[PDB]
Design a protein around this ligand. Structure first.
Ligand code: MG
Length: 283
């Protein structure tokens, strides 16, 4: 069981040590498309790049590049797209990816401004009557409704392909209370948010993969996917304590580098999975 594993690491304060073994053992694959000079302004951070083998391609002839990775968890029957927070010049590419991949939900785990700097472009409309048009990709985005809660906001958006005049409804799930420094003190509001995403149908296989992002698309975003997949595998398996968080995380790191950025985030992920196990074992 991992509940016991948690107490050992915490008793000996050896989280930084666990985290380093994960770093040394993580996969490394080429990211040649990301490092081409023509793509330098499509990357928010120089050291965070999608692997070539799992990167999402835009259906543009000119330049198909977006900093986004497909994470495929075969046993759990879950797929996720992890991406960076859009930049002023990639908002249109972001929504084009959502359209092309048939995603139903976008999960945002950061605020537009944190620590006094901009972490993400404001890529969705703030008022019903002021829609946004992305001229480069021929997409129109309208805010339909907005439900603000204490720890998160859910928005219904309408995405219209101006070329085909088709429209889809997209749900935007915005976790607004992640602290500027460190990790939340309790996983309760995080787990509540995760179960609301689940309940919406956005993670379900009838739809394209959910789009998940924070600023770099690896830290908070990694925590979200790791917790979801681990909890799903506990539902599925004959022996729920056969789920090894560390193994699951290394499998996900084959698809995008750097998932889980700090030892603090690793500890938090254990905590969320352990607490979430209470509700998945029928309570
Ligand atoms: Mg108003």
């Amino acid at each position: 069981e991992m509940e016991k594993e948690f107490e050992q690491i915490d008793k000996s304060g050896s989280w930084a040590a666990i985290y380093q073994d994960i770093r040394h053992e993580a996969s490394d694959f080429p990211c040649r498309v990301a490092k081409l000079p023509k793509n330098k302004n499509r990357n928010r951070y120089r050291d965070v790049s999608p692997f070539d083998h799992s990167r999402i391609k835009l259906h543009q002839e000119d330049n198909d590049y977006i900093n986004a990775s497909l994470i495929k968890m075969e046993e759990a029957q879950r797929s996720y797209i992890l991406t960076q927070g859009p930049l002023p010049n990639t908002c249109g590419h972001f929504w084009e990816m959502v359209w092309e991949q048939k995603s139903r939900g976008v999960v945002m785990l950061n605020r537009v401004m944190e620590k006094g700097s901009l972490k993400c472009a404001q890529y969705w409309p703030q008022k019903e009557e002021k829609e946004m048009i992305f001229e480069d990709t021929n997409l129109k985005l309208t805010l339909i409704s907005e439900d603000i809660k204490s720890y998160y906001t859910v928005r219904q958006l309408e995405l219209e392909n101006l070329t085909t005049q088709e429209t889809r409804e997209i749900l935007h799930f915005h976790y607004t209370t992640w602290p500027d420094f460190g990790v939340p003190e309790s996983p309760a509001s995080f787990l509540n948010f995760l179960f609301k995403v689940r309940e919406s149908g956005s993670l379900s296989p009838e739809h394209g993969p959910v789009v998940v992002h924070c600023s770099a698309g690896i830290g908070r975003s990694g925590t979200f996917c790791l917790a979801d997949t681990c909890l799903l595998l506990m539902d599925k398996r004959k022996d729920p304590s056969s789920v090894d968080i560390k193994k699951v995380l290394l499998e996900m790191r084959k698809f995008r580098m750097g998932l889980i950025q700090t030892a603090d985030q690793l500890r938090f992920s254990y905590l969320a999975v352990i607490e979430g196990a209470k509700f998945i074992m029928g309570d």
